[PDB]
Amino acid sequence: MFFIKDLSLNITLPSFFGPRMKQYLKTKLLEEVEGSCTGKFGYILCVLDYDNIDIQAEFNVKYRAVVFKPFKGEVVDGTVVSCSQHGFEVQVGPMKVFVTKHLMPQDLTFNAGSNPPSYQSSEDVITIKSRIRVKIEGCISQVSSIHAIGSIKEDYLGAI
Amino acid sequence: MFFIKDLSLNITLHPSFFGPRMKQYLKTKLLEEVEGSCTGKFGYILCVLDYDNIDIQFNVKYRAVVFKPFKGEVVDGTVVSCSQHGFEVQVGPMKVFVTKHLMPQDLTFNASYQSSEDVITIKSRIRVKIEGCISQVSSIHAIGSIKEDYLGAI
Amino acid sequence: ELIALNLSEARLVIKEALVERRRAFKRSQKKHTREKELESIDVLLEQTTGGNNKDLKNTMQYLTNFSRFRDQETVGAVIQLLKSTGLHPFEVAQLGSLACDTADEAKTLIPSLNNKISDDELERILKELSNLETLY
Amino acid sequence: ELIALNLSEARLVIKEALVERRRAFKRSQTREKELESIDVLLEQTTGGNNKDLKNTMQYLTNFSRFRDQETVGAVIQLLKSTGLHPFEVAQLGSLACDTADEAKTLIPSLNNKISDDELERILKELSNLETLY
């Protein structure tokens, strides 16, 4: 899920004091946080409202950012970027959701003979670039990364 | 992890069978319905124990060896298959999936997985940490990692 | 408070944030279709981002491909429609992202909706969302 | 309640159960070499399907650190007198560890329950009880 969250960051600078050290600090803020990720509260994708970032040695920098964090039970749409005997990955925002072969209908089976690799049944063909609706069955949170495992077994899931 | 757990199953038996053998029958049916079964809640009911003493009274009471993985548990297993997505480890009646992202930086795919040292492939013995368990109505899934200290090869 | 965005809002919010940042940068500097979207984004990112932010880049393409409502007006209409339901932000966000054809589908995909709104009202909402769907 | 078993005890608990069943049925009517006895034993005691039990026994056969009842009994006493939690005891009896840091790292709840010194001795004793055949 995408959210806008109020965040904070303490930065330390006496070699760079100046009438426009504020732009410098905003710069370090972007380098330090934008594009970062924690299992705690997800991906800090984009710092917002650059012109008004609140800045108060060390300075407490209060800012807002668009953040992404998956949650168990969340249903999302995405694109298949890879298949293997173990299953396929779905690109969802900045994250890859891995659907294991055991979380797919049993009639869906890997075609180790196709290219690109794919899973198929009596009706659908899931391969690279396929649009798909999946359910996040679990999120594994590491110190600086988040992992999602998904399923397309239930009703209303699968090929879009 | 393996446990010995006290369980029970209700078996519906009527007239068609009643007799001086309905106990041996109830047992045969007990083993039919629960042994080799799996549930998200309890795990794998692998083997009913103490056959000669299963308590009937039909609500049948019994003990069994069950297996259920727990988050944070470290286990040893054998690699069953590798791919660009990671590798499957056989642990007891289950396969634990170690995704490519839960494998060390300096250790990456090559098809096996290699480091300036280790080589992971089928039949290779490995120590893995259970990071997550997903329990469905009649199955359980586990994700593992080998990034932390003392995990991995051997 | 809890601010959850649907995909289309996230897209507009990120784009707007970067456009303004590009402008802030220019002012400080020393003086002297949906496919064109993907191209524009690459340029915008090159000009406003630390070059190695693949998370943001992946997010942008994702949002360009899955955003159901493309303009601020439409997005504004969608937010108004959903808020007037009294549903929780997490449900409003999913409902504004996941296109659903029936009450059953939506309620099945978003279980917390089960007992907070009737099928009839939800059906009426799905229709309105559908009707606001950018045909571009 | 639950009773946790280390791999070696689960192996013995299962063989004993199936051996007794084989008898109850016949009545009232080496590592790899053990692997071969499985198919046989399972055949005479189970439906024929139960892939889980079969995979389990092969696993237990290759990963059980203590192969005879004598040694298992000894491991149980050695670990039981530590006062550790059953889940910890089961892990210590299953995972071979060479150092206190290794064990405490793999079974983190041991950290404040026992000293490196005291755990090192348990480790040495477990290593010396380890089956060689």
UniProtKB/Swiss-Prot annotation, chain A:
Subcellular localization: Nucleus; Cytoplasm; Cytoplasm, P-body
Predominant localisation class: nucleus
A GO CC term assigned to this protein in UniProt: nucleus
GO biological process: DNA-templated transcription initiation; nuclear-transcribed mRNA catabolic process; nuclear-transcribed mRNA catabolic process, deadenylation-dependent decay; positive regulation of nuclear-transcribed mRNA poly(A) tail shortening; positive regulation of translational initiation; RNA-templated transcription; transcription by RNA polymerase II; transcription elongation by RNA polymerase II
Keyword Transcription attributed: yes
A Pfam family this chain is assigned to: SHS2_Rpb7-N
Position of the signal peptide: none
Highest taxon of source: Eukaryota
One MF term in the entry's GO annotations: single-stranded DNA binding
UniProtKB keywords: Cytoplasm, DNA-directed RNA polymerase, Nucleus, Transcription
Further facts: Present with 6420 molecules/cell in log phase SD medium.
Subunit field text: Component of the RNA polymerase II (Pol II) complex consisting of 12 subunits. RPB4 and RPB7 form a subcomplex that protrudes from the 10-subunit Pol II core complex. The RPB4-RPB7 subcomplex probably associates with TFG1. Interacts with NRD1 and PAT1.
Biological role: DNA-dependent RNA polymerase catalyzes the transcription of DNA into RNA using the four ribonucleoside triphosphates as substrates. Component of RNA polymerase II which synthesizes mRNA precursors and many functional non-coding RNAs. Pol II is the central component of the basal RNA polymerase II transcription machinery. It is composed of mobile elements that move relative to each other. RPB7 is part of a subcomplex with RPB4 that binds to a pocket formed by RPB1, RPB2 and RPB6 at the base of the clamp element.
Family per record: Belongs to the eukaryotic RPB7/RPC8 RNA polymerase subunit family.
Name of the protein this chain belongs to: DNA-directed RNA polymerase II subunit RPB7
From Swiss-Prot, chain D:
Oxidoreductase in keyword set: no
Alphabetical keyword list: Acetylation, Cytoplasm, DNA-directed RNA polymerase, mRNA processing, Nucleus, Phosphoprotein, Transcription
Major localization listed first in the record, in broad terms: nucleus
Compartment(s): Nucleus; Cytoplasm; Cytoplasm, P-body
A GO biological-process term: transcription initiation at RNA polymerase II promoter
GO cellular component: cytoplasm; nucleus; P-body; RNA polymerase II, core complex; RPB4-RPB7 complex
Molecular function as annotated in GO: nucleotide binding; translation initiation factor binding
Chain's role: DNA-dependent RNA polymerase catalyzes the transcription of DNA into RNA using the four ribonucleoside triphosphates as substrates. Component of RNA polymerase II which synthesizes mRNA precursors and many functional non-coding RNAs. Pol II is the central component of the basal RNA polymerase II transcription machinery. It is composed of mobile elements that move relative to each other. RPB4 is part of a subcomplex with RPB7 that binds to a pocket formed by RPB1, RPB2 and RPB6 at the base of the clamp element.
Assembly: Component of the RNA polymerase II (Pol II) complex consisting of 12 subunits. RPB4 and RPB7 form a dissociable subcomplex associated with the 10-subunit Pol II core complex. In exponentially proliferating cells, only approximately 20 % of the Pol II complexes contain the RPB4-RPB7 subcomplex. In starving cells, that enter stationary phase, RPB4-RPB7 is associated with Pol II in a stoechiometric manner. The RPB4-RPB7 subcomplex probably associates with TFG1. Interacts with LSM2 and PAT1.
Protein family: Belongs to the eukaryotic RPB4 RNA polymerase subunit family.
The protein, known as: DNA-directed RNA polymerase II subunit RPB4
Species in which this protein is naturally found: Saccharomyces cerevisiae (strain ATCC 204508 / S288c)
Organism phylogeny: Eukaryota, Fungi, Dikarya, Ascomycota, Saccharomycotina
Positions spanned in the full protein: 46 to 221 of 221
